[PDB]
Design a protein around this ligand. Structure first.
Ligand SMILES: CN[C@@H]1[C@@H](O)[C@@H](O[C@@H]2[C@@H](O)[C@H](O[C@H]3O[C@H](CN)CC[C@H]3N)[C@@H](NSCCNC(=O)CCNC(=O)[C@H](O)C(C)(C)COP(=O)(O)OP(=O)(O)OC[C@H]3O[C@@H](n4cnc5c(N)ncnc54)[C@H](O)[C@@H]3OP(=O)(O)O)C[C@H]2N)OC[C@]1(C)O
Ligand SMILES: CN[C@@H]1[C@@H](O)[C@@H](O[C@@H]2[C@@H](O)[C@H](O[C@H]3O[C@H](CN)CC[C@H]3N)[C@@H](NSCCNC(=O)CCNC(=O)[C@H](O)C(C)(C)COP(=O)(O)OP(=O)(O)OC[C@H]3O[C@@H](n4cnc5c(N)ncnc54)[C@H](O)[C@@H]3OP(=O)(O)O)C[C@H]2N)OC[C@]1(C)O
Ligand SMILES: [Cl-]
Ligand SMILES: [Cl-]
Lengths: 259, 260
């Protein structure tokens, strides 16, 4: 139990594989890092030191609308619409996405449940044109992370929380993919509008698979030797390439689909 | 089991005395408000609905640099400078100042430990020209709140967290006022420099007074029939005029200083 600094976190970052120009989606359990001089913003600052101004740091924001509130007819006129500039990140994703979203210069994508926050050189591209329906498919920050050959850093975070594998759930061809259909309010140029949405279910695993089955896929990909386990401060962390673990996961799901 | 809405919060705020054009400094214990459909941002939205675009909402941000870290020379090069655009509010003041600070359009003043976040029609005036030394005196959002005849809302918050009374502590003529001197990093045209600061002590009360004596002062002020109590959602709340309670508190302290 000793203090991390902005310079200290930068060298831990490089030791795990973070490099110049990297785009990296980060899932964090910030308590695992331990003591930090300047708070967790030192983590994001050290990240931008390593990747430089061309790199991008992302976080999975989502938003705070509860399903039972959304579907309560008495609540309709009182629910604030999703606003990429104002809607706060879902608390269950930890402070990290909210840390990014509230950093000046950061941007947030338009697809509510799948919304990502991004800061850095390509933050505008990663958050632009996010599909409202199927916000985990190719027209999403997750698809663009694969396209740009980005990475995913699990910063102390349990491996089941790697949202990128939901992009694999979208791409993979396996039978009986559940489809969700829901109505939610979104801000359309400043005005609240209720819009119907549809997507593949991301809150429940496919039938047969366990809730934390994302964790097993990550563990299998690391056994291939294409990842990197590393210590960020005091937090056991994993850095994996985005395109390689998506392909590994798509094949994993399609193979299971043929059983 | 009651639920607050932006609409019902605006009714509660009008009922306690918030009005069109007000400037209100808010101290909040948001848990006491109870369930809110849109989360605590409904409170800020309802307030802006009541006071209108000419009104201003404020919160007491401070910042997160700890005294033990600040004074440890082994930490000196690693401490980030205070940046009114990036330094997060001290967590001890609750989510409310950070809620305001991170709302687009909000501004945050320059005097680190005394810094305030503000949003609304006069947020720029309230946060401008905040004195680095004696940041609770006349050149501060607290002084400007008195000047603008603003209000203070304790939103479920304990009455001793009324930071406006530190402005009265600054003005009050009583003997042996403790003066604090400390060094802290700030940005001067976008570059970190360490600067020495001076102010009257706000982390400890005057010698002989309890740590929570602010609360007694507010209660004594309400005992005169000025101010107003009411429920904001489920939160027992207090709205007082800024100028009247400062004059009351300065009188209270100066009369106390003449005893013993
Ligand atoms: C419409 N909304 C959704 C919709 O989008 C859709 O949602 C899906 C969702 O349901 C799925 O969930 C399913 O799968 C998940 C994963 N298996 C489990 C639930 C299950 N139903 C979802 N799968 S994706 C999950 C993505 N999650 C993450 O990225 C988070 C990863 N992190 C962790 O898991 C951590 O373990 C965490 C839980 C966050 C707790 O860690 P910890 O508390 O230790 O650390 P934390 O990060 O919280 O920070 C603490 C320290 O931070 C410092 N701090 C905080 N604030 C500070 C401030 N202001 N200043 C300075 N410092 C600060 C501080 O040091 C803190 O420590 P301290 O407090 O001092 O002690 C896919 C989804 N799409 O369907 C459902 C909905 C509802 O419709
Ligand atoms: C350099 N820094 C300082 C320096 O400035 C100087 O500081 C002075 C300081 O030392 C003095 O302290 C002295 O006096 C104080 C007051 N008597 C006591 C200590 C003493 N030494 C100081 N005096 S003034 C203090 C001003 N304080 C306030 O304004 C706070 C008022 N509120 C309260 O007190 C509450 O009781 C509180 C503590 C906040 C707890 O309330 P609560 O539990 O209800 O928490 P919160 O309000 O945050 O609400 C939580 C809910 O909010 C929702 N939420 C949160 N986050 C959300 C997100 N992301 N999304 C959506 N919703 C969110 C949610 O519902 C939460 O609830 P849940 O978690 O879900 O259950 C003067 C100072 N100048 O000297 C010291 C230093 C260090 O040098
Ligand atoms: Cl709205
Ligand atoms: Cl409480």
């Amino acid at each position: 139990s000793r203090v991390s600094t902005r310079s200290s976190l930068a060298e831990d970052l490089r030791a795990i594989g973070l490099a110049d120009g990297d785009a990296v989606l980060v899932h964090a359990a910030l308590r695992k890092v331990g003591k930090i001089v300047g708070g967790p913003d030192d983590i994001l600052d050290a990240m931008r030191d390593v990747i430089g101004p061309a790199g991008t740091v992302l976080g999975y924001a989502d938003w705070q609308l509860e399903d039972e509130i959304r579907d309560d007819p008495a609540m309709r006129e009182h629910i604030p619409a999703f606003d990429p500039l104002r809607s706060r990140s879902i608390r269950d994703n930890g402070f990290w996405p909210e840390l990014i979203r509230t950093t000046p210069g950061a941007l947030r994508s338009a697809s509510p449940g799948a919304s990502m926050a991004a800061i850095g050189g390509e933050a505008e591209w990663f958050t632009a044109d996010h599909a409202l329906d199927y916000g985990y498919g190719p027209r999403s920050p997750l698809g663009k992370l694969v396209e740009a050959k980005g990475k995913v850093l699990m910063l102390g975070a349990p491996l089941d929380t790697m949202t990128l594998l939901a992009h694999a759930e979208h791409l993979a061809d396996f039978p009986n993919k559940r489809i969700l259909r829901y109505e939610a309010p979104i801000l359309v140029d400043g005005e609240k509008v209720w819009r119907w949405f549809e997507e593949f279910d991301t809150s429940d695993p496919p039938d047969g698979l366990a809730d934390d089955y994302f964790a097993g896929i990550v563990e299998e990909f690391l056994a291939t030797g294409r990842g990197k386990r590393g210590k960020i401060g005091e937090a056991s962390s994993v850095l994996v390439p985005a395109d390689e673990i998506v392909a590994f996961a798509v094949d994993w799901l399609e193979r299971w689909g043929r059983t």
